[PDB]
Structures are given as structure tokens and as C-alpha cells.
Amino acid sequence: MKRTFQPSVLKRNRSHGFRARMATKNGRQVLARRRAKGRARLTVSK
Amino acid sequence: AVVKCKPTSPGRRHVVKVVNPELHKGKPFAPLLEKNSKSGGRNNNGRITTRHIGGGHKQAYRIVDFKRNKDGIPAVVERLEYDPNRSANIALVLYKDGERRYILAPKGLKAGDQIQSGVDAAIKPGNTLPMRNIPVGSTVHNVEMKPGKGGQLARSAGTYVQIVARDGAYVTLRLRSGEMRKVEADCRATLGEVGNAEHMLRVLGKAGAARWRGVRPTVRGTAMNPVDHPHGGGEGRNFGKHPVTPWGVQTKGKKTRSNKRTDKFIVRRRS
RNA sequence: AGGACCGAACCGACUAAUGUUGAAAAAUUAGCGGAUGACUUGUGGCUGGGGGUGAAAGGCCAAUCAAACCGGGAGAUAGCU
RNA sequence: GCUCGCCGGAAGACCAAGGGUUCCUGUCCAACGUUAAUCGGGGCAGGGUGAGUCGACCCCUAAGGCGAGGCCGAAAGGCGUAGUCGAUGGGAAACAGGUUAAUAUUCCUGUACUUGGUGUUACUGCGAAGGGGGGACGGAGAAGGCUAUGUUGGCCGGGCGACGGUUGUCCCGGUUUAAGCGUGUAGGCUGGUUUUCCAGGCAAAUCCGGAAAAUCAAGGCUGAGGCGUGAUGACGAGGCACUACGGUGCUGAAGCAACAAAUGCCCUGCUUCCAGGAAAAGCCUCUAAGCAUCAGGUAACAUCAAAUCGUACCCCAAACCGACACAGGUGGUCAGGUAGAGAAUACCAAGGCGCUUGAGAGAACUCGGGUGAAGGAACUAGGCAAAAUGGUGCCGUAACUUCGGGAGAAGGCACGCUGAUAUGUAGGUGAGGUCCCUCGCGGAUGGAGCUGAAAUCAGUCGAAGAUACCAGCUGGCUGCAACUGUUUAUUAAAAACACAGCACUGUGCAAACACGAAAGUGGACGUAUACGGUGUGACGCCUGCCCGGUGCCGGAAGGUUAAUU
RNA sequence: AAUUCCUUGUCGGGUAAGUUCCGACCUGCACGAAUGGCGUAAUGAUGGCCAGGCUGUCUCCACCCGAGACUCAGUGAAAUU
């Protein structure tokens, strides 16, 4: 049976990449929240 | 001509075709072609604004001259071609200077005929002149509502208009819908009528034929739930309310003309 | 010529048995329907929650839908256990 | 190591996506592996990925994204021009053989090709963000010419039989060779050359388009395969000796013909139909502003350069998506033999596997199958399930009907093997020879060789000859929906939803209508034979009476009536 | 009647025997003409009924071939309390 997760690197970066988050005001707030919490990985870039 | 298909299969029993052996059998004129991508009835917001649109065959756009502003240069007709963007046919005309253009095909036009435009052109079908130099009671098509903008009325397969009277700077015309409207006596018009009067006799014959045109199926409204349409549902078939659109408008006589900038050019609405 | 006919690939899911702490949070075995078309499939794109999409079942929108998920108002209120 | 069994349009081989050392060698057995384990995709250590030609990067653009100014909006922000990004598409060039425990069209041997920089020489109108050409495009169908590939003969090497026969019409194996360069065939398309003139291609133009004459009858473009060369080479069954019995070295025969034949190539072709079938650059060509003893352009020769990143391994699966070493899911490419219409089905080749607990016993009962006396639906809500029918040719076939159908209606007969007609027939393919020629990949004649249906007659074996796998049960009456289609992913596939057709009604274009505080966008680059909404639902015969109520569409005397004053 | 409560209405056909099925009658509880009426060839994994063939569906079960169940060795769960 086909499952929900079908990986694709190109689509992953275009949806949750670092540059995608920096292109919108709300996206930049996501980075600020994660920086405050001290996350070791901010995005899914690598 | 009109030909009825034989009933060799369910789907061809009720099919009626319109065939014209005079149409060109080949590729169109490349220099007058353009790209034309489909939209699916969605606007720049990505939302559906016109329902029942989607799919169909790929099409290319032909540039048609609706202005006819080449005066004093006779042109000859080369061939008649099929146009998928409109119900009427088009013709390729070659001018003396060596230019080519597309025009709507009048009723009795054929290869070898000559056409001209201006104020000194002869009164023959296919010629374009300002309406001030057209005898009253004549039949014309491709009429402009403003001098120089281009033809906008009577452009369908077999439509035409008739000049009724001329008082001053304006003239009175009777449109195909029966409306009586007046326009300035400077707009150009073409003699004759559009030459595809048999286009109304076609019968698609099956659901698939409509899908080729890009028309998607229509859901009535009594078959939905009340959360989707005012006609809603019920145990069985009830429909105990006045007919109404989605969004709540009557649809059985209610008028929806609220311009108020026109009506100085309307004489009799219609009917 | 054909939303034509028989029938594999391919796409579907009408009947029965098994399974039901299953091999599997919907599958297996034997039959079954369509199979040049309103067909099917790869890659990328667009539509966002009282909104979308819907050949229309209140269907589907990440195993969740008569109003998704996450955080917040928040220790909502509970004449009831 | 020897037998046995299984897959073989895969359970074989090569990739993309995804994963990220799972690849190779040595070593270890605690944990991990549904058992043991000396073994492992497990632990530890070392080793392994070599490119001017393959891919990315790069040049060009589609849907779409962002968007200097700009327009709009309480703020945030929205839309969009010039531009700039974005493949799933377009754009230069490498083939064969050999080699590592693990990489190769990348290393080695042999033989090739493409695009640029610089220099020299000869001859010279070069020049763009502009014009034109080209690139450049659909579905279905048909025939011919070919190759991949297979079969048989010939040729070369070897063999004479564990049990009757086997020196012949006997048995086994091999019989392979590229890119490039030269030739330009089957076949497809288009008449060619010269002079003069012109409201068009925003300016210009020798280019494109158009007009009027002269002069000739063959010029040009595209094009699979074959042949020659590449090749006195490479490869090659078998041998001869060394050999830590892992394998290392030298040598080397034949290497031809006929027939059959694709879903691949000629073919982006040809014929035909209506639903009428991307864009831009590279490339070719003409000129403007400019520069002309320069600069640039064409040709030959020499020389230099072609960077950077990916390259191991799995990839229908134990390595990817499913919590698992999980009977599930996952796109592209390659396509042998016998029988067969076939990529179905059965048995096999190359190749790969026996699925990570076994050993005994032969109770009830459960699961998956085989057979059955007499009866034959008496079973049951219901013929649920099971049994049965099943192929090709010929004969034959009802009511009804929209004249197409119904129809494979129903039903009946014949099917193996051997010989003859004919030492292999009809047909297909086609050598030698001869004749002619503008002699060439030519034409006519000619028929050797090879390949090979179907039918008739006679005979013959068995209970059974469409013998296995494979492979329609049929007929009669009737409700509903015309029909093919669509739907509750995971208890409902239907009489429900679509549907062609029909009617009413709105809409004159800055259209009605819809998404948006707005700008704007869709409707539509459409114009009443058009578009939106509503009901009905092929087709045939038809669709009656009622305007008091509610709604909608008109009317104007009078009554009542808001802000304001 | 996909519509009929009384109702298994009455008559005829089919069966040895038919609350279903087919054809008529009209007392239509409570059909009816585009939320359409009455017909209709072809089509349907659609609802109801009757035949031929066929059979372990059944009278009524019997035997046989395989995988479990049972015994031995290794590993080693669960609901509940």
C-alpha cells in the first residue's frame, strides 16, 4: 500500500529550506523562535 | 453540408457532422500564429471563478484583423482556413504591396475574390467602409462601437445587423438580439454576413464530444446537501423553495443590468 | 471508421473462503470488470480552514474531518461522577 | 565436490528516485540474526570511486515564482512593467579489445573526433539589444525496403562409446570483429537559372514577400542498409609446460553461404480524419549607426587550452516508503530455444536461487486439495459454494428491431500418425549463364539451390487424437435506468451522480457573474449560431385545467411614509 | 404498481401442492403528464421468477494426498488478575 511519505530532496528544500524561511516575515519568526530555544539544526537544509 | 452518421455503435447513432470541402488542408500561416495556454477557469488568485471549464484539445491563436485600416490597397483571397478559437471561419488575404492578413469569412466569399476598405470602396460583401457611406437598410457585420477601436458586434457564425435609420452624427442599428442601439456615424462595418450559418445544426452525440471542447460536467444542485447549495437536499426529491443561484439570486426573471452610464444609446431593450 | 468486439501488460474492486493478539492498523488465494479512451502514468507547479476541491458520498484536504494540525487566551466552565 | 528440486517478459541483467560505506580484504562471536553459528548487510582495523567526448555545472526557454520604478491598501502587505530565476523539453565531440581482491566508454594498447585562444601566409565589406529563414511539433491507419536476431548446410578441431547397435544420411564444440573515413543505393520532397520594377517586413537592406519578361528542360535537398577501408591487427576452441592446485606464462586451426524475421531503423516520411495539434537560443542570411593603407571576415599550416563537482554498493528490494532481515507499494531500458495467434501458457538456455528453527509420530478437530455406489436442488432467505461449458474450419440459425443488430443465437459434422498424388505440390526467395546500356549499388531474360501451406485418396493404433497447461453454460418471462462512464480510500457500485438532447431565464461588452477593503484578474485575446444560472434527461407518441396564496415582471391617479428644513 | 392499509383482494396460467412470479379486472386507503406521463431495440459484476445440462448443496456421509494440532531438542509472547 502506498504510504504518505514519498521523499524528494528538491521538494524538501523548496518547502522548508533555509532560503524559503528567510523570504517571508512569518518564516523569519520561525528561525527566531528556534534560535531562542537553542536548536542545533535550524532547518532541513542538511 | 450536413451529414448523419450511421448507427454502427452507441455513441454514433445521434451524431450529425458539418463538413466543408473548401477549407484548406494543411498547416496555417506561421507568421500570424501565437501561443495560447489554458487557464481552467482560475484567476491570478488561483481560485475557480467560472465553473465547468477544464481540459480539451491544445489550440494556437490566429491573429485576426478586426480593424481593417488598410485603405486604397486592393487585396485578393487566397484560401479559407479552419479556426479553433471561434465558431466562424477565416480567410487569408494577400495585398498588392505583399502583406498578408486574416479576416472573418463573409457569406459568399471564395478564393479569387477581391476586397477593399476605405471611403471610396465599392458596395460589395467583404468591403469595409464607415457607416456614414452605407445606404440605410443594408446588412453589415463586424461593427465597431468606437471609431478605430475595432469591430465588436456580429462576429459569430451567422450573425448580422441591419442599419435602420440615420438622424445626425449617430445611426440606429437592430442587433441580432432584437435590441435597438445607436452608435456614432464614424464606426466602420463590413457588408454581408458571417458565412457559417450551418454551424447551429451540429449534434455532439455523446458526452466525450463535449469534453473535447473543454466543458466539464455540471452538477444540478438538488443533488447536493444544504451546506453546499440553497436547493440543498431532503429525504427523496423535495425542492420546496423558489429557484435560486448559488449565493442566492432568483434566476427566473430577475434583471441584473445596473450600468446607468449607458441607456443614452439604448432605444428598445429587447423582446 | 468506432467513448466498437475477445483477450495479457497496465488501471480497477462484484462474489466466496482464510485471516481478525493477522505475514498485513484492509492483505492473500480462486473467480470477476475496463483495456484507443470522459483512458492510464513519471517529473515540476497552483488553490489553505467557515476556506479549498468535489461526474455530489457530507466525499477528500499527510493512518485524524458536520469545520485539519501546532502554539497561545487556559488552571475556559462542569448545580455532574 | 557429486546428485535432486525451483524461477527463467524473472525470483536474470543495467539505471533514475531515495539511502549514504551496506562495496573489497584481514580479524573477533558478548549484544544484534525469531534456533546453533567457525558464517553475516553485526563489532574492530586497513584498503577502494582516475573523464576535453558519460552526467551535472554551463547557453535557451514552458507552467509558475520573485520583481527596480509604478498602481493599490489602517500597519503588516497585495498585484504587476522593464528585468531576473525556473526541466519533466531544445543546444559541439569515442569506439573496440585488455586489465584490479574491490573502479573504468575515466587506467593501458590500437585507431578517431569536437569547440575555442594565439601566431604565420594568401585572399578580402566587416559590423546589432534590429529584419527574415530555420529550429517547430496532433490522432489513427496502410505498404514496401532493411537490421538486431534465430535456424540449417558448409568448413575446422575432437570423439568411436559402462547394456543390444553405432566409420555414417552418426555425436559434441567453434565458426566473433566497433567508432571513424570513402561511396550515396531502396525511397521521400521541391521545376531551375538570369535581368528590371514595387504603398509591405516601424529606419535601411543585395535578404524575405509581391508583380512583369527572357531562357532551358534536370538542377538541388533529405536518406536506413549494403559494399570498401579500419584489420599482415584484435579475438579465437583446443594444446604444450611451469603450478604455493588461487591460478599464473607461450602458442594458436576454421572464421563462409542460404533461408526466416521484429513492437527496433528508413519514418520529424506517405495516406486519411476533426477535437486543428509549445516557447526561446545555438545555427544560416540581409543591413543601420560606425570603422576602411586599420579593425574585422574566409581558407591552409603550426601551436596551446578544455577548469570544477558526481563516479564505490543496493535499486520490484534484507540497503528506498511501510516501527521488523514485514507474503504490501515503487518509474525507465535489455527480450534466447521447442510448441503457440501471442510479451498468454507448459517445459528449458544464459544467469540466479531452495525463502535463518529442526527431528519424529501418522488420533479427534481446523485449513488447502483428489475420487465416489443409487438418487439429482429433495439443500437453503437465495443453486452460496462446487460441478459443468471451453479451440479451429464448414453447415445452419427464431421472436423482435432505431435495419446497425439480436448472433459465437440454438444445433450438427470433421480433427492423431504413415504413404501416395508431388523421390517436397501451390506459393515465397533467388545464384550461374546470356543480352542491352548514359557500364552502375543498373535493366531484361534465365532458372540452379534453399524454404514451405492447405486439400483429396488409401492404410493404421488406442477406451479416448481441439488428448497435458491453456480455453464462452445455454434458453424463456418481467421491474428500473437509454447507452460507454462516475461515487462513500477502510462494511453500501446501485434504480444514485455525469451524459448527448430539450425548455425557461439573465447578459449589448468596461457584459451578466465570480475571487478581491482596493488595484486588478478570470469570463475572453470570446461578442447573442456567444456566455452564466436553473430544471428535465437518448429516441418514438405527447405534455391537459387553475394567477386566489407566495415569488418574479410591468403600471401610475390616489392614500401612507426617512434623513433634511 | 419501487406507490394498495384492509390483503395471501378476485379470476386465469405454471406446480402433486405457489403469501413470490406472469396475464387480466378496477373498490386508485394515498398514480398522473418536464421535481415529466406512457412505450421502447440494444446495453448491465443491477432486482424478481421459470426450464435444460450439471453436480457431495442435500438424503448420508466414506476413503485418500499434503500443512497444523500431538511427542523430543533450542528460543520464548499476550489479554486478565
Coordinates of N, CA and C in Angstrom, one line a residue, chain B residues 83-254:
Chain B
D83 N -10.5 27.7 -38.0 CA -10.1 28.4 -36.8 C -10.7 27.8 -35.5
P84 N -9.9 27.2 -34.6 CA -10.4 26.6 -33.4 C -10.9 27.6 -32.3
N85 N -10.5 28.8 -32.5 CA -10.8 29.8 -31.4 C -12.1 30.5 -31.6
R86 N -12.9 30.2 -32.7 CA -14.1 30.8 -32.9 C -15.0 29.9 -33.7
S87 N -16.3 30.2 -33.7 CA -17.3 29.4 -34.5 C -17.2 29.6 -36.0
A88 N -16.8 30.8 -36.4 CA -16.8 31.2 -37.8 C -15.5 30.8 -38.4
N89 N -15.4 30.9 -39.7 CA -14.2 30.6 -40.5 C -13.4 31.9 -40.8
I90 N -12.2 31.7 -41.2 CA -11.3 32.9 -41.5 C -10.7 32.7 -42.9
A91 N -10.3 33.8 -43.5 CA -9.7 33.7 -44.9 C -8.4 34.5 -44.8
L92 N -7.5 34.0 -45.7 CA -6.1 34.6 -45.8 C -6.1 35.5 -47.1
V93 N -5.8 36.7 -46.9 CA -5.9 37.7 -48.0 C -4.5 38.3 -48.2
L94 N -4.1 38.4 -49.5 CA -2.9 39.0 -49.9 C -3.1 40.3 -50.6
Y95 N -2.3 41.3 -50.1 CA -2.4 42.7 -50.6 C -1.5 42.9 -51.8
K96 N -1.7 44.0 -52.5 CA -0.8 44.2 -53.7 C 0.6 44.5 -53.2
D97 N 0.8 45.2 -52.1 CA 2.2 45.5 -51.6 C 2.9 44.3 -51.1
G98 N 2.2 43.2 -50.9 CA 2.8 42.0 -50.5 C 2.6 41.6 -49.0
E99 N 1.6 42.2 -48.4 CA 1.2 41.9 -47.0 C 0.1 40.9 -46.9
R100 N 0.1 40.1 -45.9 CA -0.9 39.1 -45.6 C -1.6 39.3 -44.3
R101 N -2.9 38.9 -44.2 CA -3.7 39.1 -43.0 C -4.8 38.1 -43.0
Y102 N -5.4 38.0 -41.8 CA -6.6 37.2 -41.6 C -7.8 38.0 -41.4
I103 N -8.9 37.6 -42.0 CA -10.2 38.3 -41.8 C -11.3 37.3 -41.7
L104 N -12.4 37.7 -41.1 CA -13.6 36.8 -41.0 C -14.1 36.5 -42.4
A105 N -14.6 35.3 -42.5 CA -15.2 34.9 -43.8 C -16.6 35.3 -44.0
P106 N -17.0 36.2 -45.0 CA -18.4 36.5 -45.2 C -19.2 35.3 -45.8
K107 N -20.4 35.6 -46.1 CA -21.3 34.5 -46.5 C -20.8 33.9 -47.8
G108 N -20.8 34.6 -48.9 CA -20.5 34.1 -50.2 C -19.1 34.4 -50.7
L109 N -18.1 34.4 -49.8 CA -16.7 34.7 -50.2 C -16.0 33.4 -50.6
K110 N -15.1 33.5 -51.6 CA -14.3 32.3 -52.0 C -13.0 32.8 -52.6
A111 N -12.1 31.8 -52.8 CA -10.8 32.2 -53.3 C -10.9 32.9 -54.7
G112 N -10.1 33.9 -54.8 CA -10.0 34.7 -56.1 C -10.8 36.0 -56.0
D113 N -11.7 36.2 -55.0 CA -12.4 37.4 -54.8 C -11.5 38.5 -54.4
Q114 N -11.9 39.8 -54.6 CA -11.2 41.0 -54.3 C -12.0 41.7 -53.2
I115 N -11.2 42.3 -52.3 CA -11.8 43.1 -51.2 C -11.0 44.4 -51.1
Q116 N -11.7 45.4 -50.5 CA -11.0 46.7 -50.3 C -11.7 47.4 -49.1
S117 N -11.0 48.4 -48.6 CA -11.5 49.2 -47.5 C -11.2 50.7 -47.7
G118 N -12.0 51.5 -47.1 CA -11.9 53.0 -47.2 C -13.3 53.6 -47.4
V119 N -13.2 54.8 -47.9 CA -14.5 55.6 -48.2 C -14.9 55.5 -49.6
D120 N -14.0 55.2 -50.5 CA -14.2 55.1 -51.9 C -14.4 53.6 -52.4
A121 N -14.4 52.7 -51.5 CA -14.6 51.3 -51.8 C -16.0 51.0 -52.4
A122 N -16.1 50.0 -53.2 CA -17.4 49.6 -53.8 C -18.3 49.0 -52.7
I123 N -19.6 49.0 -53.0 CA -20.6 48.4 -52.1 C -20.7 46.9 -52.5
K124 N -19.8 46.1 -52.0 CA -19.8 44.7 -52.2 C -19.5 44.0 -50.9
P125 N -20.0 42.7 -50.7 CA -19.7 42.0 -49.5 C -18.2 41.8 -49.3
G126 N -17.7 42.0 -48.1 CA -16.3 41.9 -47.7 C -15.6 43.3 -47.7
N127 N -16.2 44.3 -48.2 CA -15.7 45.6 -48.1 C -16.0 46.3 -46.8
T128 N -15.1 47.1 -46.3 CA -15.3 47.9 -45.1 C -15.2 49.4 -45.3
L129 N -16.3 50.1 -44.9 CA -16.4 51.5 -45.0 C -17.0 52.1 -43.7
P130 N -16.8 53.3 -43.5 CA -17.6 54.0 -42.4 C -19.1 53.9 -42.6
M131 N -19.8 53.7 -41.6 CA -21.3 53.6 -41.7 C -21.9 54.8 -42.3
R132 N -21.3 56.0 -42.3 CA -21.8 57.2 -42.9 C -22.0 57.0 -44.4
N133 N -21.2 56.1 -45.1 CA -21.3 55.9 -46.5 C -22.0 54.6 -46.9
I134 N -22.9 54.1 -46.0 CA -23.6 52.9 -46.2 C -25.1 53.2 -46.4
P135 N -25.7 52.8 -47.5 CA -27.2 53.1 -47.6 C -28.0 52.5 -46.4
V136 N -29.0 53.2 -46.0 CA -29.9 52.7 -44.9 C -30.6 51.4 -45.4
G137 N -30.8 50.6 -44.4 CA -31.4 49.3 -44.6 C -30.4 48.2 -45.1
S138 N -29.1 48.5 -45.1 CA -28.2 47.5 -45.6 C -27.8 46.5 -44.4
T139 N -27.3 45.4 -44.8 CA -26.8 44.3 -43.8 C -25.3 44.4 -43.7
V140 N -24.8 44.4 -42.5 CA -23.4 44.5 -42.2 C -23.0 43.7 -41.0
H141 N -21.7 43.5 -40.8 CA -21.3 42.7 -39.7 C -19.9 43.3 -39.3
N142 N -19.5 42.8 -38.1 CA -18.2 43.3 -37.5 C -18.2 44.8 -37.3
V143 N -19.1 45.3 -36.6 CA -19.3 46.7 -36.3 C -18.5 47.2 -35.1
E144 N -18.0 48.4 -35.2 CA -17.2 48.9 -34.1 C -18.1 49.9 -33.2
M145 N -18.0 49.8 -31.9 CA -18.7 50.7 -31.0 C -18.0 52.0 -30.8
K146 N -16.7 52.1 -31.2 CA -16.0 53.4 -31.1 C -15.1 53.5 -32.3
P147 N -15.0 54.7 -32.9 CA -14.1 54.8 -34.1 C -12.7 54.4 -33.9
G148 N -12.2 53.4 -34.5 CA -10.9 53.0 -34.5 C -10.6 51.8 -33.5
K149 N -11.4 51.6 -32.6 CA -11.2 50.5 -31.6 C -11.1 49.2 -32.3
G150 N -12.1 48.9 -33.2 CA -12.2 47.6 -33.8 C -13.6 47.0 -33.7
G151 N -13.9 46.1 -34.6 CA -15.2 45.5 -34.6 C -15.5 44.7 -33.3
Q152 N -16.7 44.8 -32.8 CA -17.1 44.1 -31.6 C -18.5 43.4 -31.7
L153 N -19.3 43.8 -32.7 CA -20.7 43.2 -32.8 C -20.8 42.4 -34.0
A154 N -21.7 41.4 -33.9 CA -22.0 40.5 -35.0 C -20.7 39.8 -35.6
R155 N -20.1 39.0 -34.7 CA -18.9 38.3 -35.0 C -19.0 36.8 -35.0
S156 N -20.2 36.3 -34.7 CA -20.4 34.8 -34.6 C -20.6 34.2 -35.9
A157 N -21.1 32.9 -35.9 CA -21.0 32.1 -37.1 C -21.9 32.7 -38.2
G158 N -23.1 33.1 -37.9 CA -24.1 33.6 -38.9 C -24.8 34.8 -38.5
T159 N -24.2 35.7 -37.7 CA -24.8 36.9 -37.2 C -24.7 38.0 -38.1
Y160 N -25.6 39.0 -38.0 CA -25.6 40.2 -38.8 C -26.4 41.3 -38.1
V161 N -26.2 42.5 -38.6 CA -27.0 43.6 -38.1 C -27.5 44.4 -39.3
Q162 N -28.6 45.2 -39.1 CA -29.2 46.0 -40.1 C -29.3 47.5 -39.7
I163 N -28.9 48.4 -40.6 CA -29.0 49.8 -40.3 C -30.4 50.2 -40.6
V164 N -31.0 50.8 -39.6 CA -32.5 51.2 -39.6 C -32.6 52.6 -40.0
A165 N -32.0 53.6 -39.4 CA -32.1 55.0 -39.7 C -30.9 55.8 -39.3
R166 N -30.8 57.0 -39.8 CA -29.7 57.9 -39.5 C -30.2 59.3 -39.3
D167 N -30.1 59.8 -38.1 CA -30.6 61.1 -37.8 C -29.5 62.2 -37.9
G168 N -28.4 62.0 -37.2 CA -27.4 63.0 -37.2 C -26.0 62.3 -37.2
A169 N -25.2 62.7 -36.2 CA -23.9 62.1 -36.1 C -24.0 60.6 -35.7
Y170 N -25.2 60.1 -35.3 CA -25.4 58.8 -34.9 C -26.3 58.0 -35.9
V171 N -26.2 56.7 -35.9 CA -27.1 55.8 -36.7 C -27.7 54.8 -35.7
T172 N -28.8 54.3 -36.1 CA -29.6 53.3 -35.4 C -29.5 51.9 -36.0
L173 N -29.2 50.9 -35.2 CA -29.0 49.5 -35.7 C -29.9 48.6 -34.8
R174 N -30.3 47.5 -35.5 CA -31.0 46.5 -34.8 C -30.1 45.3 -34.7
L175 N -29.8 44.9 -33.4 CA -28.8 43.8 -33.2 C -29.5 42.5 -33.3
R176 N -28.7 41.4 -33.3 CA -29.2 40.1 -33.5 C -30.1 39.7 -32.4
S177 N -30.0 40.3 -31.2 CA -30.8 40.0 -30.0 C -32.1 40.8 -30.0
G178 N -32.4 41.6 -31.0 CA -33.6 42.4 -31.1 C -33.4 43.8 -30.5
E179 N -32.3 44.1 -29.8 CA -32.1 45.4 -29.2 C -31.9 46.4 -30.2
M180 N -32.4 47.6 -30.0 CA -32.2 48.8 -30.8 C -31.2 49.7 -30.2
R181 N -30.0 49.8 -30.7 CA -28.9 50.7 -30.2 C -28.5 51.6 -31.3
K182 N -28.0 52.8 -30.8 CA -27.4 53.8 -31.7 C -26.0 54.0 -31.4
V183 N -25.2 54.2 -32.5 CA -23.7 54.4 -32.4 C -23.4 55.6 -33.3
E184 N -22.2 56.1 -33.1 CA -21.7 57.2 -33.9 C -21.6 56.8 -35.4
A185 N -21.8 57.8 -36.3 CA -21.7 57.5 -37.7 C -20.3 57.7 -38.2
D186 N -19.4 57.1 -37.5 CA -18.0 57.1 -38.0 C -17.4 55.7 -37.8
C187 N -18.1 54.7 -37.2 CA -17.5 53.4 -37.0 C -17.6 52.6 -38.3
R188 N -16.6 51.8 -38.6 CA -16.5 51.0 -39.8 C -17.3 49.8 -39.6
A189 N -17.8 49.2 -40.8 CA -18.6 48.0 -40.8 C -18.3 47.3 -42.1
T190 N -18.5 46.0 -42.2 CA -18.3 45.2 -43.3 C -19.6 44.7 -43.9
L191 N -19.8 44.7 -45.2 CA -21.0 44.3 -45.8 C -21.1 42.8 -45.8
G192 N -22.4 42.3 -45.7 CA -22.7 40.9 -45.7 C -22.8 40.3 -44.3
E193 N -22.8 39.0 -44.3 CA -22.9 38.2 -43.0 C -21.8 37.2 -42.9
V194 N -21.6 36.7 -41.7 CA -20.6 35.6 -41.5 C -21.1 34.3 -42.1
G195 N -20.2 33.7 -42.8 CA -20.6 32.5 -43.7 C -20.4 31.2 -43.0
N196 N -21.1 30.9 -41.9 CA -21.1 29.6 -41.3 C -22.5 29.3 -40.7
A197 N -23.5 29.7 -41.4 CA -24.9 29.6 -40.9 C -25.3 28.2 -40.5
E198 N -24.6 27.1 -41.0 CA -24.9 25.8 -40.7 C -24.3 25.3 -39.4
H199 N -23.5 26.1 -38.7 CA -22.8 25.7 -37.5 C -23.8 25.3 -36.4
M200 N -25.0 25.8 -36.4 CA -26.0 25.5 -35.4 C -26.7 24.2 -35.5
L201 N -26.5 23.5 -36.7 CA -27.1 22.2 -36.9 C -26.3 21.0 -36.4
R202 N -25.1 21.3 -35.9 CA -24.2 20.2 -35.4 C -24.8 19.5 -34.2
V203 N -24.7 18.2 -34.0 CA -25.1 17.5 -32.8 C -23.9 16.7 -32.3
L204 N -23.5 17.0 -31.1 CA -22.3 16.3 -30.5 C -22.5 14.8 -30.4
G205 N -23.6 14.4 -29.8 CA -23.9 13.0 -29.9 C -23.5 12.1 -28.7
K206 N -22.5 12.6 -27.9 CA -22.1 11.8 -26.8 C -21.4 12.8 -25.8
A207 N -21.2 12.3 -24.6 CA -20.5 13.1 -23.5 C -19.1 13.4 -23.9
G208 N -18.4 12.4 -24.5 CA -17.0 12.7 -24.8 C -16.7 13.8 -25.7
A209 N -17.7 14.1 -26.6 CA -17.5 15.2 -27.6 C -17.5 16.5 -26.9
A210 N -18.3 16.7 -25.8 CA -18.3 17.9 -25.1 C -16.9 18.1 -24.3
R211 N -16.3 17.0 -23.8 CA -15.1 17.1 -23.1 C -14.0 17.6 -24.1
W212 N -14.1 17.3 -25.4 CA -13.1 17.7 -26.3 C -13.1 19.3 -26.4
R213 N -14.2 19.9 -26.2 CA -14.4 21.3 -26.3 C -13.9 22.0 -25.0
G214 N -13.6 21.3 -23.9 CA -13.1 21.9 -22.7 C -14.2 22.2 -21.7
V215 N -15.4 21.5 -21.8 CA -16.5 21.7 -20.9 C -16.6 20.5 -19.9
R216 N -16.6 20.8 -18.7 CA -16.7 19.9 -17.6 C -18.1 19.7 -17.1
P217 N -18.4 18.5 -16.5 CA -19.8 18.2 -16.2 C -20.4 19.2 -15.2
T218 N -21.7 19.3 -15.2 CA -22.5 20.2 -14.4 C -23.3 19.4 -13.4
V219 N -23.2 19.8 -12.1 CA -24.0 19.2 -11.0 C -25.2 20.1 -10.7
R220 N -26.4 19.5 -10.7 CA -27.6 20.3 -10.7 C -27.7 21.2 -9.5
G221 N -27.8 20.7 -8.3 CA -27.9 21.5 -7.1 C -29.0 20.9 -6.2
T222 N -30.0 20.2 -6.7 CA -30.9 19.5 -5.9 C -30.2 18.2 -5.4
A223 N -29.1 17.8 -6.0 CA -28.4 16.6 -5.6 C -27.3 16.8 -4.6
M224 N -27.2 18.0 -4.1 CA -26.2 18.4 -3.1 C -26.9 18.4 -1.7
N225 N -26.1 18.6 -0.7 CA -26.5 18.8 0.7 C -26.8 20.3 1.0
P226 N -27.6 20.6 2.0 CA -27.9 22.1 2.2 C -26.7 22.9 2.6
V227 N -25.6 22.2 3.0 CA -24.3 23.0 3.3 C -23.7 23.5 2.1
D228 N -24.0 22.9 0.9 CA -23.3 23.3 -0.4 C -24.1 24.2 -1.2
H229 N -25.5 24.0 -1.3 CA -26.3 24.8 -2.2 C -27.6 25.2 -1.5
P230 N -28.2 26.3 -1.9 CA -29.5 26.6 -1.3 C -30.6 25.6 -1.5
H231 N -30.5 25.0 -2.7 CA -31.5 23.9 -3.0 C -31.3 22.7 -2.2
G232 N -30.2 22.5 -1.6 CA -30.0 21.5 -0.5 C -30.4 20.1 -0.9
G233 N -31.0 19.4 0.1 CA -31.3 18.0 -0.1 C -32.7 17.7 0.4
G234 N -32.8 16.7 1.3 CA -34.1 16.2 1.7 C -34.3 14.7 1.5
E235 N -35.2 14.1 2.2 CA -35.4 12.6 2.1 C -36.2 12.4 0.8
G236 N -35.4 12.1 -0.3 CA -36.0 12.0 -1.6 C -35.8 13.2 -2.4
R237 N -36.8 13.6 -3.2 CA -36.8 14.9 -4.0 C -37.9 15.8 -3.5
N238 N -37.5 16.9 -2.9 CA -38.5 17.8 -2.3 C -38.5 19.2 -3.0
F239 N -37.4 19.9 -3.1 CA -37.3 21.2 -3.7 C -38.5 22.1 -3.3
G240 N -38.6 22.5 -2.1 CA -39.7 23.3 -1.7 C -39.4 24.8 -1.5
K241 N -38.7 25.4 -2.5 CA -38.3 26.8 -2.4 C -38.2 27.3 -3.8
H242 N -38.1 28.6 -3.9 CA -38.0 29.3 -5.2 C -36.7 29.0 -5.8
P243 N -36.6 28.8 -7.2 CA -35.3 28.6 -7.8 C -34.3 29.8 -7.5
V244 N -33.1 29.5 -7.4 CA -32.1 30.4 -7.0 C -30.7 29.9 -7.4
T245 N -29.8 30.9 -7.7 CA -28.4 30.5 -7.9 C -27.7 30.0 -6.7
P246 N -26.5 29.5 -6.8 CA -25.6 29.6 -5.6 C -25.4 31.1 -5.3
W247 N -25.2 31.4 -4.0 CA -25.1 32.8 -3.5 C -26.5 33.5 -3.4
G248 N -27.6 32.9 -3.8 CA -28.9 33.4 -3.5 C -29.4 34.5 -4.4
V249 N -29.6 34.2 -5.7 CA -30.3 35.1 -6.7 C -31.3 34.3 -7.5
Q250 N -32.4 35.0 -7.9 CA -33.6 34.3 -8.3 C -33.3 33.3 -9.5
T251 N -33.0 33.9 -10.6 CA -32.7 33.2 -11.9 C -34.0 32.9 -12.7
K252 N -35.1 33.5 -12.4 CA -36.4 33.2 -13.1 C -37.1 34.5 -13.4
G253 N -36.4 35.5 -13.9 CA -37.0 36.7 -14.4 C -36.3 38.0 -13.8
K254 N -35.5 37.8 -12.7 CA -34.9 39.0 -12.1 C -33.8 39.5 -13.1

